[PDB]
Structures are given as C-alpha cells and as structure tokens.
Amino acid sequence: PVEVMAENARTGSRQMQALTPAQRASAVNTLADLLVSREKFILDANAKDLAEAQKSGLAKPLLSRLSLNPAKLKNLSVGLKQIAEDSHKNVGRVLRRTRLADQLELKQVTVPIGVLLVIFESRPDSLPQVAALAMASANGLLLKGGKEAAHSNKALMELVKEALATVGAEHAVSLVSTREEISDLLSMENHIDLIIPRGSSDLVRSIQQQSLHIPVLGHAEGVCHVYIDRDADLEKALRIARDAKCDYPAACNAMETLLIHEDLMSGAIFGDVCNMLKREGVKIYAGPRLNQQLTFGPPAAKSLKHEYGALECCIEVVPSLDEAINHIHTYGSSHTDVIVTENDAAARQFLGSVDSACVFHNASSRFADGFRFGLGAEVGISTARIHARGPVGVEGLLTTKWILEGQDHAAADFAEGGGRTWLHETLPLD
Amino acid sequence: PVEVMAENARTGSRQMQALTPAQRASAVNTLADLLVSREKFILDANAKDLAEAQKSGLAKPLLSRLSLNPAKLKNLSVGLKQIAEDSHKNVGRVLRRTRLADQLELKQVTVPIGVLLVIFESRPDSLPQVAALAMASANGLLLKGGKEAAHSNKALMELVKEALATVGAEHAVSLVSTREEISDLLSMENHIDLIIPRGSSDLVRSIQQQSLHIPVLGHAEGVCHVYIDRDADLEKALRIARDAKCDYPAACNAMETLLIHEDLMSGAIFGDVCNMLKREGVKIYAGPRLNQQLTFGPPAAKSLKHEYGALECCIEVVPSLDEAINHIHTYGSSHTDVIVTENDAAARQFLGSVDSACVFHNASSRFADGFRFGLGAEVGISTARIHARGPVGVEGLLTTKWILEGQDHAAADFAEGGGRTWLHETLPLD
C-alpha cells in the first residue's frame, strides 16, 4: 500500500537509531563499493530508459539531465566516501551538560527527524546521494521519482536496499509509483516530516502551494542582487558580475539584477558592463530610475520581481546605500545578496543590515553551493525562516531531545518543603 | 490598520537589529524599573477589569487567572532582571569560522526571526515577560489579548512602549483589537513568522487547525507516561507518581497514564498505588490488559489517547519493556516520558529508544518547566519536530545567516582555469 510504506519506514528509523559507532559508516562505505562494482546494471538501464523517453520528447532540461556516465558514478563514489569519512559523529552527539542540583545532570542530545520524503524530477544521480545522507543521519526515508528514469530508479533502489541489508538488517528506504496522486501522498501526516523537494522551480512551487500543515524545506525563487558600491575597483566589479551571471545562468542563485551606485554612473562603468554583457550575449532590461536616466536605452522591465533563468538581467540604479538595502528587502527574496567595495564602513553597514539567507562581500554569488562552504554534501537550499537557512548540510536533519538522569528527585521536593538547591553550572559538554 | 502594524514591526526589527552591546540590556532593565515604580496604574486597572468581568462570569480558570498582585509584579521584576543579566550575547554571536582559500573566511552568525505573533488568552502577567523576550532577542513583536484583561493589556502596553522608547527610539511592539477576526489575521503571511500560542489546550488546538502555511510553535496535548520498571524501589515509585500527578493536575506535562511492569504486580504495588491515589482523591480508570486482569475493578477507559486535566489517570500494564516502548510511541504524544528503576541496562534501552520530546530517569515529569532546566525564561513548550523541541528558551527565536568576507574571489576562478585551492580548516569560533 502507501501508508504501510511510511509506517515501516518509521520502524526502520527506530531500528537504525542504535548502531552509530562505525556501523552506518561501513554501511555507506559498502554502498559506495556497490556503486563502483555493479555499474553495468544501472548503465544499461539508463541507456534503455533514455532511448525510450527520446520518442516522447518531454523537455530538453530533463532529457539532457537524466543521462549517466561512468564519470558521474565515480563522482558519486567519491562523494559517498566523503560522507562516510566525515559522518562519524552526527547521531548521539551532545550539545549541553548542565547540573541543577546534587546528582541530577541535564544533557541535550542529537536525534533523527523521522520519515523524510524526497521529491525530485527525474535525476537518477541524486538518489544514491540522498540515500547516503539518510543512512548517515540515521533517519528513515521515502523517495518519489517521476515518469522518466523509472527503470534507473528501480535499479538504484535495489542497489541501495542490498547495500543497506548488510548491517541494520531492516529496509527503511522505499519508492512510490507513478506520481501516486501527489496531492494524496502530500496530504498525509502523522507519518512524514520533511518534504525535501529537489527538482526545479515548478516543482518546489507546486509543492509549497499544495503542501498544507507539513514542514517543507527548500525555496521557490532565486532573485539575487549585486550592489556595486562607489569605492570598488572597476574591473573588479566587471569580473564579479561576469562570473556571477555567465557561468550557470539557469542556476538557482545566479544574479537576476544588478544595482549600481548612481555616483559611479559618471565613470562610464555602465558602458563597460553593458559591453561585457553584450560580449557574453545577455538581453538586459532597465530599471525605472535607469529608464528615466538615459535617452532611449534598453527596454522597460516588465516586473522587478521577475525570474529569467535565461540570459537576462535587469539593471537599476539607486542613490544611496540605504535605498539599496530597502530595495533588496522589498523585491529580493532574501536568498543570496552580495556587495563589492573597498570601504570597510559600507561593508559593515550592508553585512549587518540586509536580511538575506547569506550575504557576501567582494565574493561571487555562485559560492552558495553547499559543497563550497565546507558543508559536506548539501541536501537543499533552505530559505525557510526556521531550523535551516541557506545551504543545509546534514545537520539540517537532526533535532534535539532533552534527557535527564537523576537519582531520586521529585517535583515539589524543590519547594520550601524539601532542601534542594540550584547550581546551573554548565559542565564540559562532550 | 492591521497590516501596517506588521510592516512597522518589521521596520522596528531592522532598527533594533544594530545596538546589541549593553543597549537592549539597559532597555529591559529600564522596563523592570518601570514595572516596579509605576505599579499603581496597572494595579487599579486590573481591579477595574476584574470587577467588570465578574458579572459576565466567563470561566473559573480565566476569572481566577487574570488576577495580579504586587507579589506577582515583584516576580516579573526579578525575572526581567534575570533576562537582562543573562541576555548579553544572544544577537551577533558566531557559530562557525571556516577558511576555504587564501583570504576568504566563512562565518555563520545569529540573527532575529522577524515579526513574532504572540497569542494568549487573558493572562496579563505574560505580556511583560514576552515583551522582554522580544527586546532581548532583537525581533519585533505583535500581541493579541482576549476579551478580558483589555484595560490591563493597554496599560501594560503603554508601559512597555515607554520603556522601549528610551533607547532604540522606534516602537516595534503593538496590539490588536477584540479578536480581530483571528482567522483573517492568521491567514496573513509575508509579514508574520511565529504564531506563539500561550493560552491553553483549546487555543493551541484552534490555532493548529486554522493555521495553514505559517510556522506555529507550541504543542496541543500533554499525554505523559510513567513506566515503573521491575527493579525500582517501591516507595520510590510511590513518591514519583504522587509528585507527578498531585501537584498541578491541570498542567500541560502531568502524567495522564501510568504503565506498570506485569511482573511487579505480584508485589501488591498496585494496591499501594491505588491506595495512594485514593488518599489523594483521583478517579482512576483501567487499561484493557488490567481490565482483563482483575475481578471487577475500576471502570473501563473510554479511549487510551484521552486528556483529563482533572484528577483522573488511566493505568495499564505491559509484559515487557519493548512493549511499553511501542505503547508510548503509539499512544503518547511524545511530550514527556519517564522511567524509574535501579537497572542501568533498561535505563539505556529506554533513554535511547523512546522518541519523546524529553525523557527522564528516576526524575519527576514535572521538571519540564523551562525555568528548571536552567534555560532562562521559557517562551513555550515546543513539540514540533523542527527548530525547537521541548522547552524553548530564547534561542528558539534565533536563526542563522551565512556571511562571507573575501578579497577578490570569483566562482569559476576555482575551476581548472584559476589556481585556487581548498582548506576547510575550522578556525577558532568566537
């Protein structure tokens, strides 16, 4: 059925909960060994499914993305080994050690979350990565593919189930049928905790709209912003904008705006940046203030909160820093915002005023990739304002659970009737 | 209006965001000085509103709770001073310091959340506590009273606005009218972040049901459980159960069940515990297994997942530890579960198997009060499975915000084209 999936997943979570030292590490190690030693199967299956899906011709993104090569499998192998090696102290780690009275020691610890539900469009390289993340964060996990990558998905699922059955001995990983009336599966509760979308803009949008009363990690928009201050080296700003837009224009955190200090427009920097974008072939719009600025110029931007993905980038100009800050707050989706300058003052102003999910300074807006932060293998880009924000490592999958080991204590024994005191001496946390 | 409330609150949040060292501490200090020096006003106002609400006779809980005495104001004063003294490093604290390459140092920091919405039934002693929590966690804050405590609420709001206008100079605290079509205000979004209910079971229930697409802290049920193991001192279990149930039977974390090891039923402990509860006057039910156990016994429990609040407590009996664990998982709302014993083995079994919000061992289920954990002044009892679990201090009001201060770096400059490396050396976090 459908619900027995989630129930058995929860049972398997309770199962895996108690093996931490060197067991789940060896489990994900063996998953890597499977992924390197049994590559013929998934390879031929991906060949079959791509050849089949060619004739339907769904979309160039999907039909170009669901490919799979021995190089990508080598990449998955080394990534799984990485998770294995740096995933030794994720479950059971303590966060506090307090003493309240004689022989009563509080300590808050780490636990799984529960039954994660991963939702992605056909992308058969994710599946082992997210399964390794599950097995290293000890929580059970469901999955949900698409219409394509079906046979590849089933092959990889059999692979991960084999790799998991070695130690732990219980299969808490699953998969659901063709779209399984996604609204129905989503409306469920008491079973699943985190809808982790992974597909694309359309998918996360439909999710956040349909999902009611269940926490949904991930974002929906990627409207960056790149404020070029008045005390920034010119070619510096040039290369920053170039490397921000001209590397993965369809990515989730690529600049879809570029504000400029109105003072600096006098130094022909506008001409230079337009020349650069034109050399790179980008259809630029203009902003109402810039629209008013020059003679006839580029077309008028439809909406300032628009998302292009292709090679398009609005350009507006603001008088003062604080106006730029207000602009970013009003329009930007608080995802990823930068600033380039050589002044420390404006740097502190920005980095302490803006409320994005992550703010840079003279860096490039294409660093928010999780892997680059030295943050393991990231499982999403959280923009939600609770529990996770920016790139989420695996620690975006672990809550807390207060435990307490007294001897004989009681509740009102600490009132005037009983002679018990308070210390609150923070012990050395392990 | 209603929305301009939230917008101005957000502006005030951005305002207060940048004063941390000794300023907000002095602000909440001065709030305490107001609460101690201007007590006549709120006192007479509470007198008036209680005298008025007497004639309507709404409910004994409310009409007994909205009282207010100089002793309670002394309590609020010392609590606000406590928050002041231990609230010095809540905003701006760093959590990581990483180095990725030459002169590019990541660091994840602490921030407010946004526009908190506190919802409580008439309880005019909370208002200054939650306003102090706001002003010490730097985030703006709305409020929502009830039909009673109205004049008291307005008096205390004027008081807190005076105290806040000293430093910060912007009023980011508000209040809304009589129930303001709670569904309307709740349906809002893009403005408010945390519905923090504080009233009672009915209130949090109506909230969690009505609230769609907005994070809601707090719980809805308090079904504890007290498993008395087979190697526990008898009078120990006696006093543990007594102090668990017979201190605040209407509280949110008072035992509403008591499982016993079927082996220990042979030692007349059942007779003793029933005698104790009877001496304390508690209408006990029985559990299906206990129902089958004895001759005619106490009545049959209607539903095992019931909530009494008054002096009633089911009693069931389970054969083996693991069966007790499964029982707690199936029925209990994972709020607060204990275990009494003298065996270390079963202790580890329990404390590592059960997935409640907090698990004790030989302690009393009436410790989960926030204040007792050495956890400041608690703002709720989180049972939600994200961002907060168990008693939430003020740290349940602070997310993270990755910042990044490089010199000249770029995105594809770290591919094969540019000679830049990776270090990931975790610097000493401040």
Side-chain angles (χ1 to χ4, degrees), chain A residues 119-132:
Chain A
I119 280 185
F120 51 70
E121 308 289 33
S122 293
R123 190 103 46 87
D125 46 357
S126 72
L127 191 59
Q129 198 64 26
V130 80

Side-chain angles (χ1 to χ4, degrees), chain A residues 236 359 361 389 402 404 408, chain B residues 236 359 361 402 404 408:
Chain A
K236 171 65 56 57
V359 306
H361 163 277
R389 189 166 171 80
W402 304 89
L404 204 162
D408 303 318
Chain B
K236 171 65 56 57
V359 306
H361 163 277
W402 304 89
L404 204 162
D408 303 318

Side-chain angles (χ1 to χ4, degrees), chain A residues 344-359:
Chain A
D344 180 33
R348 300 219 313 182
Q349 183 71 41
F350 204 91
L351 307 184
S353 195
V354 53
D355 76 328
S356 90
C358 40
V359 306

Side-chain angles (χ1 to χ4, degrees), chain B residues 169-367:
Chain B
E170 278 194 354
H171 51 58
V173 168
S174 298
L175 196 139
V176 302
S177 167
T178 186
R179 192 176 187 267
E180 206 59 276
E181 271 188 340
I182 187 182
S183 282
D184 184 301
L185 175 139
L186 174 147
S187 90
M188 300 161 27
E189 204 276 334
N190 314 282
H191 308 104
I192 68 187
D193 308 352
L194 283 181
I195 312 292
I196 296 189
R198 207 186 257 260
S200 59
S201 78
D202 52 343
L203 186 44
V204 303
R205 190 166 309 152
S206 167
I207 288 302
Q208 304 267 53
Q209 297 313 307
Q210 159 73 253
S211 157
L212 297 187
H213 189 248
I214 174 171
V216 167
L217 194 142
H219 57 71
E221 312 79 357
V223 187
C224 298
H225 272 81
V226 177
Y227 166 88
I228 298 180
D229 200 44
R230 84 192 182 201
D231 181 81
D233 179 81
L234 322 173
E235 59 82 20
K236 171 65 56 57
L238 170 147
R239 58 178 294 219
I240 283 305
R242 179 250 184 274
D243 297 66
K245 195 40 188 273
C246 298
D247 290 338
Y248 205 111
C252 274
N253 68 276
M255 53 93 80
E256 304 174 24
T257 299
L258 169 77
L259 318 184
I260 321 175
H261 199 74
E262 207 199 47
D263 184 11
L264 217 52
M265 289 288 283
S266 79
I269 302 305
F270 179 72
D272 299 333
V273 58
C274 306
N275 286 327
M276 186 89 167
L277 271 299
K278 178 255 289 180
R279 294 183 212 111
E280 311 307 311
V282 173
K283 164 72 93 156
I284 76 168
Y285 300 180
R289 286 191 74 121
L290 190 77
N291 220 355
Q292 187 270 359
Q293 183 82 6
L294 297 188
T295 169
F296 44 87
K302 177 55 197 310
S303 62
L304 274 299
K305 305 180 68 67
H306 208 78
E307 48 277 19
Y308 310 145
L311 278 304
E312 303 83 57
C313 81
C314 318
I315 289 179
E316 205 271 353
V317 171
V318 286
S320 43
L321 302 85
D322 305 332
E323 192 40 70
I325 312 300
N326 295 21
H327 191 284
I328 301 189
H329 293 310
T330 312
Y331 293 115
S333 166
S334 65
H335 190 305
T336 310
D337 307 333
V338 317
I339 179 172
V340 296
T341 176
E342 304 301 322
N343 172 18
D344 180 33
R348 300 219 313 182
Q349 183 71 41
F350 204 91
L351 307 184
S353 195
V354 53
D355 76 328
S356 90
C358 40
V359 306
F360 307 141
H361 163 277
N362 284 140
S364 158
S365 180
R366 202 70 186 80
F367 269 97

Side-chain angles (χ1 to χ4, degrees), chain A residues 239-250:
Chain A
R239 58 178 294 219
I240 283 305
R242 179 250 184 274
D243 297 66
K245 195 40 188 273
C246 298
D247 290 338
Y248 205 111

Side-chain angles (χ1 to χ4, degrees), chain B residues 87-209:
Chain B
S87 55
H88 188 277
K89 51 180 176 182
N90 275 116
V91 186
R93 179 168 60 101
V94 303
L95 301 184
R96 301 193 206 202
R97 296 285 290 280
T98 304
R99 187 145 40 185
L100 305 179
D102 203 277
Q103 308 308 133
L104 175 136
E105 315 186 352
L106 181 89
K107 46 173 283 191
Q108 164 192 68
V109 297
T110 306
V111 288
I113 279 185
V115 184
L116 264 68
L117 179 82
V118 176
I119 280 185
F120 51 70
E121 308 289 33
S122 293
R123 190 103 46 87
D125 46 357
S126 72
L127 191 59
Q129 198 64 26
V130 80
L133 287 169
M135 271 156 36
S137 173
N139 33 354
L141 179 141
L142 303 195
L143 293 145
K144 188 174 182 67
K147 284 80 51 175
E148 314 87 314
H151 311 304
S152 66
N153 282 313
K154 288 169 187 41
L156 276 174
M157 273 284 313
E158 293 283 340
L159 204 59
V160 306
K161 279 159 98 90
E162 199 294 327
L164 206 158
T166 77
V167 170
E170 278 194 354
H171 51 58
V173 168
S174 298
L175 196 139
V176 302
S177 167
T178 186
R179 192 176 187 267
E180 206 59 276
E181 271 188 340
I182 187 182
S183 282
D184 184 301
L185 175 139
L186 174 147
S187 90
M188 300 161 27
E189 204 276 334
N190 314 282
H191 308 104
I192 68 187
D193 308 352
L194 283 181
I195 312 292
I196 296 189
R198 207 186 257 260
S200 59
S201 78
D202 52 343
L203 186 44
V204 303
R205 190 166 309 152
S206 167
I207 288 302
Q208 304 267 53
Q209 297 313 307

Side-chain angles (χ1 to χ4, degrees), chain A residues 194-306:
Chain A
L194 283 181
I195 312 292
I196 296 189
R198 207 186 257 260
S200 59
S201 78
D202 52 343
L203 186 44
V204 303
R205 190 166 309 152
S206 167
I207 288 302
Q208 304 267 53
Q209 297 313 307
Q210 159 73 253
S211 157
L212 297 187
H213 189 248
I214 174 171
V216 167
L217 194 142
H219 57 71
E221 312 79 357
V223 187
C224 298
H225 272 81
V226 177
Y227 166 88
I228 298 180
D229 200 44
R230 84 192 182 201
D231 181 81
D233 179 81
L234 322 173
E235 59 82 20
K236 171 65 56 57
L238 170 147
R239 58 178 294 219
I240 283 305
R242 179 250 184 274
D243 297 66
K245 195 40 188 273
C246 298
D247 290 338
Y248 205 111
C252 274
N253 68 276
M255 53 93 80
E256 304 174 24
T257 299
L258 169 77
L259 318 184
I260 321 175
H261 199 74
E262 207 199 47
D263 184 11
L264 217 52
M265 289 288 283
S266 79
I269 302 305
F270 179 72
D272 299 333
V273 58
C274 306
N275 286 327
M276 186 89 167
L277 271 299
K278 178 255 289 180
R279 294 183 212 111
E280 311 307 311
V282 173
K283 164 72 93 156
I284 76 168
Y285 300 180
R289 286 191 74 121
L290 190 77
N291 220 355
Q292 187 270 359
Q293 183 82 6
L294 297 188
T295 169
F296 44 87
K302 177 55 197 310
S303 62
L304 274 299
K305 305 180 68 67
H306 208 78

Side-chain angles (χ1 to χ4, degrees), chain A residues 332-355:
Chain A
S333 166
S334 65
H335 190 305
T336 310
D337 307 333
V338 317
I339 179 172
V340 296
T341 176
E342 304 301 322
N343 172 18
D344 180 33
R348 300 219 313 182
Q349 183 71 41
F350 204 91
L351 307 184
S353 195
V354 53
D355 76 328

